[PDB]
Amino acid sequence: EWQENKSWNAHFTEHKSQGVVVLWNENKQQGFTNNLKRANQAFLPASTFKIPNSLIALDLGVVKDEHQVFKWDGQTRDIATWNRDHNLITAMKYSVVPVYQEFARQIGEARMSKMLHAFDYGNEDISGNVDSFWLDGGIRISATEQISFLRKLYHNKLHVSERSQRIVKQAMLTEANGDYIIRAKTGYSTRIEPKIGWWVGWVELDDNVWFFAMNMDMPTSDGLGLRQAITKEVLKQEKIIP
Ligand SMILES: O=C(O)c1cccc(-c2ccc3[nH]ccc3c2)c1
Provide the CA 236 distance to its chain's centre, in angstroms: 21
- HEC sequence for 187-234: EEECCCCCCEEEEEEEEECCCCEEEEEEEEECCCHHHCCHHHHHHHHH
> How far apart (Å, rounded) are the C-alpha atoms in residues 108 and 100?
12
What CATH number has the domain bearing residue 42? 3.40.710.10
Report which of 227, 46, 238 is spatially closest to residue 141, judged by C-alpha positions.
46
Q: Which residue, by CA, sits nearest to atom 13 of ligand 1?
A: 221
* Cβ 187 vs Cβ 206: under 8 Å: no
Residue 4: Cβ-neighbour burial (10 angstroms; 0-12, 13-18, 19+): middle
189 lines ligand 1 (CB under 6 A): no
> How far apart (Å, rounded) are the C-alpha atoms in residues 113 and 154?
22
Report which of 48, 27, 17, 63 is spatially closest to residue 218, judged by C-alpha positions.
17
* Cβ 216 vs Cβ 197: under 8 Å: yes
Strand-strand pairing, 209-217 and 19-25? antiparallel
Whole-number Cα distances in Å, 113 to 2, 70, 122, 141, 171: 31, 24, 12, 15, 23
Report which of 122, 6, 104 is spatially closest to residue 62, judged by C-alpha positions.
104
> How far apart (Å, rounded) are the C-alpha atoms in residues 199 and 193?
18
The one-character DSSP state at 8 is G
Upper half-sphere CA count for residue 54 (Cβ side, 13 Å): 30
Domain extent, residue 177, equals 1-242
- CA of 215 relative to ligand 1 center, distance in Å: 15
The one-character DSSP state at 129 is -
* Cβ 224 vs Cβ 89: under 8 Å: no
* Cβ 153 vs Cβ 168: under 8 Å: yes
Q: Into how many domains does the chain fold? A: 1
Strand-strand pairing, 2-4 and 196-204? unpaired
Report which of 212, 208, 206 is spatially closest to residue 235, judged by C-alpha positions.
212
User: Nominal resolution in Å?
Assistant: 2.2
241 lines ligand 1 (CB under 6 A): no
Report which of 210, 234, 235 is spatially closest to residue 31, judged by C-alpha positions.
210
187 lines ligand 1 (CB under 6 A): yes
- Which residue of the set 47, 54, 164, 189 is catalytic? 47
81 lines ligand 1 (CB under 6 A): no
Alpha helices in the chain (DSSP H): 9-13, 36-39, 50-60, 88-93, 97-107, 109-118, 133-136, 143-154, 162-171, 226-237
Atom of ligand 1 nearest to the CA of 224: 3
Upper half-sphere CA count for residue 103 (Cβ side, 13 Å): 32
Atom of ligand 1 nearest to the CA of 186: 1
122 lines ligand 1 (CB under 6 A): no
Q: State yes or no: is 127 an active-site residue.
A: no
Count other C-beta atoms under 10 Å from residue 220's C-beta: 8
Q: Which residue, by CA, sits nearest to atom 1 of ligand 1?
A: 187
Report which of 126, 135, 150, 181 is spatially closest to residue 43, judged by C-alpha positions.
135
> How far apart (Å, rounded) are the C-alpha atoms in residues 200 and 39?
13
Q: Which residue, by CA, sits nearest to atom 16 of ligand 1?
A: 221
> How far apart (Å, rounded) are the C-alpha atoms in residues 118 and 120?
5
The dihedral formed by the CA atoms of 152, 114, 116 and 3, expressed in degrees to the nearest 10: -60
3-state secondary structure of 95: coil
3-state secondary structure of 21: strand
CA Rg, the chain, in Å? 17
